[PDB]
Design an enzyme around this catalytic site. Structure first.
Site, PDB file in Angstrom:
ATOM      1  N   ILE A  19     -33.278  16.864  28.506  1.00  0.00           N
ATOM      2  CA  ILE A  19     -32.374  16.951  29.166  1.00  0.00           C
ATOM      3  C   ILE A  19     -31.182  17.434  29.261  1.00  0.00           C
ATOM      4  O   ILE A  19     -30.866  18.791  29.596  1.00  0.00           O
ATOM      5  CB  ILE A  19     -32.360  15.836  30.145  1.00  0.00           C
ATOM      6  CG1 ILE A  19     -33.680  14.924  30.644  1.00  0.00           C
ATOM      7  CG2 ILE A  19     -30.940  16.246  31.382  1.00  0.00           C
ATOM      8  CD1 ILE A  19     -33.391  14.254  31.212  1.00  0.00           C
ATOM      9  N   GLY A  20     -30.109  17.147  28.268  1.00  0.00           N
ATOM     10  CA  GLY A  20     -28.482  17.726  28.418  1.00  0.00           C
ATOM     11  C   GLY A  20     -28.258  17.258  26.450  1.00  0.00           C
ATOM     12  O   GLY A  20     -28.605  16.726  25.494  1.00  0.00           O
ATOM     13  N   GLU A  21     -27.197  17.063  26.869  1.00  0.00           N
ATOM     14  CA  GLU A  21     -26.025  16.696  25.906  1.00  0.00           C
ATOM     15  C   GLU A  21     -25.244  15.734  26.148  1.00  0.00           C
ATOM     16  O   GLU A  21     -23.914  15.899  27.018  1.00  0.00           O
ATOM     17  CB  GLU A  21     -25.148  17.917  25.049  1.00  0.00           C
ATOM     18  CG  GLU A  21     -26.032  18.793  23.996  1.00  0.00           C
ATOM     19  CD  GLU A  21     -26.955  18.447  22.991  1.00  0.00           C
ATOM     20  OE1 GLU A  21     -28.314  18.772  22.543  1.00  0.00           O
ATOM     21  OE2 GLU A  21     -26.160  17.051  22.420  1.00  0.00           O
ATOM     22  N   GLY A  22     -24.911  14.134  25.687  1.00  0.00           N
ATOM     23  CA  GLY A  22     -24.045  13.544  25.966  1.00  0.00           C
ATOM     24  C   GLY A  22     -22.603  13.259  24.902  1.00  0.00           C
ATOM     25  O   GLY A  22     -22.589  14.797  24.133  1.00  0.00           O
ATOM     26  N   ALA A  23     -22.347  12.561  24.896  1.00  0.00           N
ATOM     27  CA  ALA A  23     -20.734  12.351  24.350  1.00  0.00           C
ATOM     28  C   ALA A  23     -21.014  11.909  23.095  1.00  0.00           C
ATOM     29  O   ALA A  23     -20.271  12.295  22.123  1.00  0.00           O
ATOM     30  CB  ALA A  23     -19.646  11.312  24.637  1.00  0.00           C
ATOM     31  N   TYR A  24     -22.606  11.425  23.201  1.00  0.00           N
ATOM     32  CA  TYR A  24     -22.394  11.032  21.925  1.00  0.00           C
ATOM     33  C   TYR A  24     -24.134  11.558  20.454  1.00  0.00           C
ATOM     34  O   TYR A  24     -24.447  11.027  20.231  1.00  0.00           O
ATOM     35  CB  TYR A  24     -22.810   9.168  21.711  1.00  0.00           C
ATOM     36  CG  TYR A  24     -21.692   8.477  22.067  1.00  0.00           C
ATOM     37  CD1 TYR A  24     -21.056   8.467  23.418  1.00  0.00           C
ATOM     38  CD2 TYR A  24     -20.718   7.884  20.809  1.00  0.00           C
ATOM     39  CE1 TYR A  24     -20.030   7.763  23.607  1.00  0.00           C
ATOM     40  CE2 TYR A  24     -19.525   7.591  21.853  1.00  0.00           C
ATOM     41  CZ  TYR A  24     -18.930   7.546  22.894  1.00  0.00           C
ATOM     42  OH  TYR A  24     -18.358   6.781  23.352  1.00  0.00           O
ATOM     43  N   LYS A  42     -31.369   7.934  25.997  1.00  0.00           N
ATOM     44  CA  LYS A  42     -29.513   8.844  25.968  1.00  0.00           C
ATOM     45  C   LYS A  42     -29.810   8.185  24.412  1.00  0.00           C
ATOM     46  O   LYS A  42     -29.761   6.789  24.211  1.00  0.00           O
ATOM     47  CB  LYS A  42     -28.925   8.604  26.549  1.00  0.00           C
ATOM     48  CG  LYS A  42     -28.906   8.189  28.132  1.00  0.00           C
ATOM     49  CD  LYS A  42     -27.785   8.227  28.516  1.00  0.00           C
ATOM     50  CE  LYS A  42     -26.120   8.818  28.977  1.00  0.00           C
ATOM     51  NZ  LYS A  42     -25.727   8.557  29.973  1.00  0.00           N
ATOM     52  N   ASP A 137     -12.863   5.416  35.837  1.00  0.00           N
ATOM     53  CA  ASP A 137     -13.446   6.362  35.375  1.00  0.00           C
ATOM     54  C   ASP A 137     -14.100   7.133  37.064  1.00  0.00           C
ATOM     55  O   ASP A 137     -15.320   8.333  36.419  1.00  0.00           O
ATOM     56  CB  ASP A 137     -13.606   7.393  34.322  1.00  0.00           C
ATOM     57  CG  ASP A 137     -13.656   8.530  33.991  1.00  0.00           C
ATOM     58  OD1 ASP A 137     -12.519   9.533  34.760  1.00  0.00           O
ATOM     59  OD2 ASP A 137     -14.224   9.166  32.904  1.00  0.00           O
TER      60      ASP A 137
HETATM   61  N1  LIG Z   1     -30.414   8.176  33.960  1.00  0.00           N
HETATM   62  C1  LIG Z   1     -29.891   9.941  33.561  1.00  0.00           C
HETATM   63  N2  LIG Z   1     -30.968  10.267  34.340  1.00  0.00           N
HETATM   64  C2  LIG Z   1     -30.936  11.757  34.376  1.00  0.00           C
HETATM   65  N3  LIG Z   1     -30.403  12.291  33.590  1.00  0.00           N
HETATM   66  C3  LIG Z   1     -29.000  11.620  32.839  1.00  0.00           C
HETATM   67  C4  LIG Z   1     -29.516  10.322  33.230  1.00  0.00           C
HETATM   68  N4  LIG Z   1     -28.154   9.556  31.890  1.00  0.00           N
HETATM   69  C5  LIG Z   1     -27.472  11.557  31.630  1.00  0.00           C
HETATM   70  N5  LIG Z   1     -28.193  12.567  32.383  1.00  0.00           N
HETATM   71  C6  LIG Z   1     -27.902  14.193  31.886  1.00  0.00           C
HETATM   72  O1  LIG Z   1     -27.664  13.655  30.224  1.00  0.00           O
HETATM   73  C7  LIG Z   1     -26.556  14.265  30.595  1.00  0.00           C
HETATM   74  C8  LIG Z   1     -25.684  13.842  29.693  1.00  0.00           C
HETATM   75  O2  LIG Z   1     -24.960  12.617  30.078  1.00  0.00           O
HETATM   76  P1  LIG Z   1     -23.778  11.909  29.473  1.00  0.00           P
HETATM   77  O3  LIG Z   1     -23.991  11.375  28.321  1.00  0.00           O
HETATM   78  O4  LIG Z   1     -23.498  10.680  31.251  1.00  0.00           O
HETATM   79  O5  LIG Z   1     -22.789  12.886  29.060  1.00  0.00           O
HETATM   80  P2  LIG Z   1     -21.319  13.283  29.407  1.00  0.00           P
HETATM   81  O6  LIG Z   1     -21.193  12.071  30.686  1.00  0.00           O
HETATM   82  O7  LIG Z   1     -20.563  13.872  29.070  1.00  0.00           O
HETATM   83  O8  LIG Z   1     -22.390  14.167  31.235  1.00  0.00           O
HETATM   84  C9  LIG Z   1     -25.624  14.126  32.133  1.00  0.00           C
HETATM   85  O9  LIG Z   1     -24.925  15.672  32.015  1.00  0.00           O
HETATM   86  C10 LIG Z   1     -26.743  13.848  32.588  1.00  0.00           C
HETATM   87  O10 LIG Z   1     -27.172  15.266  33.658  1.00  0.00           O
END
Ligand SMILES: Nc1ncnc2c1ncn2[C@@H]1O[C@H](COP(=O)(O)OP(=O)(O)O)[C@@H](O)[C@H]1O
Length: 346
Positions: A19-24, A42, A137
Site C-alpha cells: 500500500i505505502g510507507e509509514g513512519a516506521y 503495518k 493531532d
Molecule cells: N488501516 C489502514 N487501511 C488502509 N490503508 C492504510 C491503513 N493505515 C495506513 N494506511 C496507508 O499506509 C500509509 C502509511 O500510513 P501511516 O503509517 O499512518 O504513515 P503516515 O501517517 O506518515 O501516512 C498511509 O498513508 C495510508 O494511506
C-alpha cells in the site's frame, strides 16, 4: 515473505500488496483467512530509537484499551516469541481504503456527507475525551474512511492524558502537532493539555470540509496566528485578560486591529447551522469554546444525535504513562508485554 523487504505475517495472513510507507515501516493489505476478509498490516521497526519506542508503546496501549466504532482498532499483533528475537512488530487493522485528506484532494462533499463525517468525528472524540485522553493531532489524514464512509480516528502518537492544571507555558513554546490544525493558545500560552485543543482541530476540519482547502494554512508559527486573526478578528479585551503571560499578551496588543470576516462570506454555500457550529468550535477563547457533548447536541447534527448510542470509556487513563523517563530497553520490554495477548494461547 518479502514485498521489497521482509514482511512475514505468519500462517494467518496471505497474498500481500504494497500500500505505502509509514513512519516506521511499510504497509500492505493481506487476506485474513480466519475472518476471510482483506485487512491492513503495518510493519513497525522502532527499537533502535527511544522516541520511536515511546510513540509505539503509547499508541499500542491506547488503541488496545479503546473500543469504539469511530476509532481504529488493533485486530491482531504479530511479533517474535521472545524479546531477543523481536526486531519488528506487525499491527493488523481493518482495511480502510481512504482518508479524509485523500478524499478532499479530489472530491466535493455533499452537505449530507459533511454532516455525517462531522458526527462520526465527534462521536469518536467524545469517547476519547471521556477516557481523559487528548488526541492532539486531529487532521484529515488521521481520519480514515472505508468504501461505505465509516470514519475512524487514528494516529495516537502524540496523545496525552488531560492535565488542565499544568497547561500553562511561556510565549512561543516548541509544539509538535501538525501546524494548520493547532489552536491559537498553543502559540501563546498553552502546552495543549486541555480538551479544547481537539475541538479547535475539529473546527478546522469542518471548515476544510466546507470548502476543500485548509482554512488556516499558516507557513510557520506566528503566521498560523495571523491567519486565525485575519478571520476571527482581533481577540476582545475579555479574551486578552485570560492570557496572563506578558509576552503573549503584548504580542497580540502589538498587532493591527482586524475585524471578523463573516463565515457566510467565506462559505457562501454552507448550511447555516454548520456555520453556527463552526463558529462555536473556532472561538479564540478556549474556555468559551464548545465542548464535544455540546457540539454533538448542536441543531446541525440533529438527525444523528443519540446520546444512548454515543458511548463513553468504561476505563479512563488516570496516568500519564510517565513515558519520557524510560530507556529504549525498558520500552522494548513494555511493548513485548503489551503485545502478549495476541500470542497463541497464554
Ligand atoms: N488501516 C489502514 N487501511 C488502509 N490503508 C492504510 C491503513 N493505515 C495506513 N494506511 C496507508 O499506509 C500509509 C502509511 O500510513 P501511516 O503509517 O499512518 O504513515 P503516515 O501517517 O506518515 O501516512 C498511509 O498513508 C495510508 O494511506
Amino acid at each position: 515473505m518479502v514485498r521489497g523487504q521482509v514482511f512475514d505475517v505468519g500462517p494467518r495472513y496471505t497474498n500481500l500488496s504494497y500500500i505505502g510507507e509509514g513512519a516506521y515501516g511499510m504497509v500492505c493489505s493481506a487476506y485474513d483467512n480466519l475472518n476471510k476478509v482483506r485487512v491492513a498490516i503495518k510493519k513497525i521497526s522502532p527499537f533502535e530509537h527511544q522516541t520511536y519506542c515511546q510513540r509505539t508503546l503509547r499508541e499500542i496501549k491506547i488503541l488496545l484499551r479503546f473500543r469504539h466504532e469511530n476509532i481504529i482498532g488493533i485486530n491482531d499483533i504479530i511479533r517474535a516469541p521472545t524479546i531477543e528475537q523481536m526486531k519488528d512488530v506487525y499491527i493488523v487493522q481493518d482495511l480502510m481504503e481512504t482518508d479524509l485528506y485523500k478524499l478532499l484532494k479530489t472530491q466535493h462533499l455533499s452537505n449530507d456527507h459533511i454532516c455525517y463525517f462531522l458526527y462520526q468525528i465527534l462521536r469518536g472524540l467524545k469517547y476519547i475525551h471521556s477516557a481523559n485522553v487528548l488526541h492532539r493531532d486531529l487532521k484529515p489524514s488521521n481520519l480514515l474512511l472505508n468504501t461505505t464512509c465509516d470514519l475512524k480516528i487514528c494516529d495516537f502518537g502524540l496523545a496525552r492524558v488531560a492535565d488542565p492544571d499544568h497547561d500553562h507555558t511561556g510565549f512561543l513554546t516548541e509544539y509538535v502537532a501538525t501546524r494548520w490544525y493547532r489552536a491559537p493558545e498553543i502559540m501563546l500560552n498553552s502546552k495543549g493539555y486541555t480538551k479544547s485543543i481537539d475541538i479547535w482541530s475539529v473546527g478546522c476540519i469542518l471548515a476544510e470540509m466546507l470548502s476543500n482547502r485548509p482554512i488556516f494554512p499558516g507557513k510557520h508559527y506566528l503566521d498560523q496566528l495571523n491567519h486565525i486573526l485575519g478571520i476571527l478578528g482581533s481577540p476582545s479585551q475579555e479574551d486578552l485578560n485570560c492570557i496572563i503571560n506578558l509576552k503573549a499578551r503584548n504580542y497580540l496588543l502589538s498587532l493591527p486591529h482586524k475585524n471578523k470576516v463573516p463565515w457566510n462570506r467565506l462559505f457562501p454555500n454552507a448550511d447555516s447551522k454548520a456555520l453556527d457550529l463552526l463558529d462555536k468550535m473556532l472561538t479564540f477563547n478556549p474556555h468559551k469554546r464548545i465542548e464535544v457533548e455540546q457540539a454533538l447536541a448542536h441543531p446541525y447534527l440533529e438527525q444523528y444525535y443519540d446520546p444512548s448510542d454515543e458511548p463513553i470509556a468504561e476505563a479512563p487513563f488516570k496516568f500519564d504513562m510517565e513515558l519520557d523517563d524510560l530507556p529504549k530497553e525498558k520500552l522494548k520490554e513494555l511493548i513485548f508485554e503489551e503485545t502478549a495477548r495476541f500470542q497463541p494461547g497464554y
